[PDB]
Design an enzyme around this catalytic site. Structure first.
Site, PDB file in Angstrom:
ATOM      1  N   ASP A   1      19.160  88.478  67.392  1.00 18.29           N
ATOM      2  CA  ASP A   1      18.749  89.741  67.995  1.00 18.29           C
ATOM      3  C   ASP A   1      18.061  90.635  66.967  1.00 18.29           C
ATOM      4  O   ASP A   1      18.305  90.519  65.767  1.00 18.29           O
ATOM      5  CB  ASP A   1      19.958  90.464  68.589  1.00 18.29           C
TER       6      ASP A   1
ATOM      7  N   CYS B   1      23.507  80.627  65.573  1.00 16.16           N
ATOM      8  CA  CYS B   1      22.835  80.846  66.849  1.00 16.16           C
ATOM      9  C   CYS B   1      23.841  81.189  67.942  1.00 16.16           C
ATOM     10  O   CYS B   1      24.978  80.720  67.922  1.00 16.16           O
ATOM     11  CB  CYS B   1      22.033  79.606  67.246  1.00 16.16           C
TER      12      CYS B   1
ATOM     13  N   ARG C   1      15.036  83.074  71.655  1.00 15.72           N
ATOM     14  CA  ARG C   1      15.077  82.629  70.268  1.00 15.72           C
ATOM     15  C   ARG C   1      15.030  81.105  70.185  1.00 15.72           C
ATOM     16  O   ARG C   1      14.180  80.537  69.500  1.00 15.72           O
ATOM     17  CB  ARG C   1      16.340  83.149  69.578  1.00 15.72           C
TER      18      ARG C   1
END
Length: 162
Positions: free
Chosen positions: A72, A104, A110
């Site tokens: 983020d 992750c 992403r």
């Protein structure tokens, strides 16, 4: 410091690379976490996230510290790229085709976004790559990402492209 437990991460082997995605959001002990990436043969720490601690253990362990705001936030599509190639270029240039441990959450955005950046620089076509990570997930990289690579040009960082 805790030991015990048997955390089973996720190793992703690419054309000529290999990374390790932490199933859970980092470890509450670290000790066991370091062993996980160390046993899997990964000479890189999953510091790829909202890390805010000095590498003490993994540091003396001779493991490449991979700390990036991949979790983020982070800068726009153009800066992170530097670390992307650099890391993937170091972890491999420092270890014998070893693995790269990265942090992750669930993936999405992403997931395909990051992988896409390295994928293209690896020598894959932007369009082709996109269609791939896109077909496996509606609107995966779509957005500033797609447009970014559209105008962006591969400097041939990770091998030869096109």
């Amino acid at each position: 410091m805790a030991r015990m437990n048997r955390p089973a991460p996720v190793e992703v082997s690419y054309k000529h690379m290999r990374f390790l995605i932490t199933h859970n959001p980092t470890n509450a002990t670290l000790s066991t976490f370091i062993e996980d990436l160390k046993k899997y043969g990964a000479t890189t720490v999953v510091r790829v996230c909202e890390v805010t601690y000095d590498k003490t253990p993994l540091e003396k362990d001779g493991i490449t510290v991979v700390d990036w705001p991949f979790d983020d936030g982070a800068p726009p599509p153009g800066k992170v790229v530097e670390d992307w190639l650099s890391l993937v270029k170091a972890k491999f240039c420092e270890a014998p085709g070893s693995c790269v441990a990265v942090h992750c959450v669930a993936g999405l955005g992403r997931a395909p976004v990051l992988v896409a950046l390295a994928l293209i620089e690896s020598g894959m076509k932007y369009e082709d790559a996109i269609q791939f990570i896109r077909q496996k997930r509606r609107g995966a990289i779509n957005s500033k990402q797609l447009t970014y690579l559209e105008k962006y040009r591969p400097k041939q960082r990770l091998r030869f492209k096109d």
